[PDB]
Design a binder for these strands. Structure first.
Ligand code: NA
Lengths: 185, 178
DNA sequence: GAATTTCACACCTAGGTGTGAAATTC
DNA sequence: GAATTTCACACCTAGGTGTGAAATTC
């Protein structure tokens, strides 16, 4: 159709996804890396929208890193998608959302109910980021949802795959101290 | 019904008594203290934007002579970054203009150009988004008057800045050490 | 000269990284 | 016993302070 939400920097995302991506969750909440950013077109420049982010459980079980490989390791469990995170620019005009990429750089993932906007995930479960565009002031309350398969990841309390850790060190600026340390060897 | 009151007024008057001063720089300088207001009496479900500008507090240039201050169009506006937003949001917690930058030359976004050694009064405006009538409220805060400067001149003001602005903790610590 | 502005600087606030040892968990 | 979670730590990014010598204006 006319509404288009495209993943930005999809090739960085794909490098993580080849290895099976992992996202740290902590007690106090952990930012994602890479950050989910999208390009939006086809909105009404003059309408009002809010952007929401939640995380759909990518399957019905859990996951285990056994001998350098991820292994389905659970008996089936229920349904729940996560709570929602509201993009901080919400609410805003379509034109604002279309002028630059919509970046969810401040969402924090956690493994505990204490949500200052934090998204509680279940460790060792796999998730698929999903973005909702909510039209504000609409008597029909129209909402459109987009999933981003290349951003799937497994929530962990510590990195399992050492190749993931290396990629995170390579590209996340807040991890630069470990990057420079590897270039020292 | 619509009320907009100054937050942390007593920290402002401590500055006000000494004649308050705000640094401007080429790029842009944050205010200290930060202007924060409480809002009540908005429609919780209506959409509003909050705007900030600065009005001339008098007609004189100023200069500092032996420990005393002796003896102009409105500034551009700064839109609070939470705009646009529901009345509920503006009312749930103080509205704080913590990221506005005061400058002597516009060279970037989020900046208000003032002209140095003049006295200015902050003014806040509220507008309803989509209001078919062109309707604005304005709210002045004489307690927050100040003189723009490129360097502090009353040493007593600098002392208060160092005492209360957390980003100047290195100079507070230093003086405690001496 | 005297008055006002710019600047590089040291030192903070504020907060995001993975590490690795220890605690917890089943 | 061993998988999972916790958490104090060093080391970053990012950027807000006043300072004082230097530059600019007057
Ligand atoms: Na400027």
């Amino acid at each position: 159709g006319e509404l288009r939400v495209g993943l930005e920097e999809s090739e960085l995302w794909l490098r993580f996804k080849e290895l099976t991506n992992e996202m740290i969750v902590t007690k106090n909440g952990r930012r994602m890396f890479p950050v989910l950013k999208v390009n939006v077109s086809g909105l009404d420049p003059n309408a009002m929208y809010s952007f929401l982010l939640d995380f759909v459980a990518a399957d019905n079980h859990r996951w285990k890193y056994v001998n350098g490989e991820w292994v389905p390791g659970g008996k089936p469990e229920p349904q729940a998608p996560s709570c929602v995170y509201i993009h901080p620019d919400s609410p805003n005009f379509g034109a604002h959302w279309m002028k630059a990429p919509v970046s969810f750089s401040k969402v924090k993932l956690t493994n505990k109910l204490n949500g200052g906007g934090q998204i509680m995930l279940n460790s060792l479960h796999k998730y698929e980021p999903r973005i909702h565009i909510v039209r504000v002031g609409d008597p029909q309350r129209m909402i459109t949802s987009h999933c981003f398969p290349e951003t799937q990841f497994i929530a962990v309390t510590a990195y399992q795959n050492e190749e993931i850790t290396a990629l995170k060190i390579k590209y996340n600026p807040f991890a630069k101290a470990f990057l420079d340390a590897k270039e020292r060897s």
